[PDB]
């Protein structure tokens, strides 16, 4: 069972910040709201939009942020690459311990999703290899990890994509993939299997006791790699056999023979089985979230 | 189209470690009241047997040591309902939402919270299987529930794990679900089926994201798809069960009897090498409630 992460110190930071004619998610963290910066553009304005020129236009007044009932005073803003950030008068009191972190694709966390500043559901999700999150008015919602009482902030959403998908950016205001705030023709490169997010998880079905699908195989990385390659899988690098190496030595099966087992999975198949729960290969599970 | 859960933030600020002699679980604490299983009083050697009248008879308040994080709480009174065990506390939870105390039927879904020892850990959503039992993830004593407007309906407690791995537990006036009890003694799952409702509304959400390939020109029977339904362990469908269906019927222009031919005909040709919503196997854990509130 993918768990997300308790969301209630995140829901303490959510707002509602709006612009003219747009709203969206915003989030409050001591006297800062982080937020998208085309809250400041119309629809027209986001084929072409020239950031700078818009932004100088505004003052403080032209941001309404309401938390809740309140609504907060901006006294100040500033863009910082594409992420809006208003400075208020009121340091929010439900402010956790955090940090901002930016992730690499095949890691996992929890996002928020939100709807006009009120927290609507809560979701575990990978950031796809291909820089996109398969997810589900959202702007401005923003992904997280928790680890002893401090929340990691690591991802706000700013688009979606023809095919589906969400793209956003760190709280740096940097985007993942090669995507901007444009409404343009760009679209996802391919998509592949996070590789090592699978085998992780077969680790997980021994540990859980289940067996069926190894063999007495095993394979050389260049052999695994050339063959997973032609399922669309993400090449598997030294540096992933060694974050496995915790799960290899705790059930014995050295990583190269786990990936003999997931080649001979792949072209196979599980004959009508399961392994944890599922009935096909799971990859947003991280070595460190089976563990 | 992904399961999501109800934020837990309501949730996380009610819930508390309970400790009488060695046994150690999660409780939930509404006003002055930590709720949590009765077995928390049970011994090792007792939960064969348990005389749970008798054992609690022997307990006074000083047994139950209840700390909120860093601060112990001070019990000042005890009682059963069931099998939930109930303690009043000196002091009222101030983060106490509005709530109610709810039992839910098989086939709804709900959201848990897990917790180690009073610090929640996790939430994801599930489903109450039809035969009342909860494929879940020391958790003993987390909750289910489901918010509306501000408003948490609690509708679970976890109790037991059973040999198959699954999950036994009350509702938060101490009933079970389903044929299991607060023993350690032989108990098993009945065989499980899947959640026919929860199916076609499943498929109905994929009309809506736009994959309509399974649809067919062909409309069937409640009686002749039940009885293609009884040979693949799915539950029968009702009229109720249509009814509930007929707002997305109206949003999407599929009537539920077409959409049971498309199940049905789904059932035994299989998918031929397509999926749904980028799944082969037909998910069975979102309501159509579910599916309407997410769409």
Redesign the interface.
Known sequence: ?????????V??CMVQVTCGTTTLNGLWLDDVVYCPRHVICTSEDMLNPNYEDLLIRKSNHNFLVQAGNVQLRVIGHSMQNCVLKLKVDTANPKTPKYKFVRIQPGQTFSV??CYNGS?????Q?AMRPNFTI???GSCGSVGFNIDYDCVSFCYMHHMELPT?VHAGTDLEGNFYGPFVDRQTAQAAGTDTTITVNVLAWLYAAVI?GDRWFLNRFTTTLNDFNLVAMKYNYEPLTQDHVDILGPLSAQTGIAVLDMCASLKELLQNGMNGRTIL????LEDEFTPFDVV
């Open positions: 069972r993918k768990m997300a992460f308790p969301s209630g110190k829901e303490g928020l999703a927290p609507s559901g809560v979701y999700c398969k997810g589900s589906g859980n729960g599922s009935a096909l």
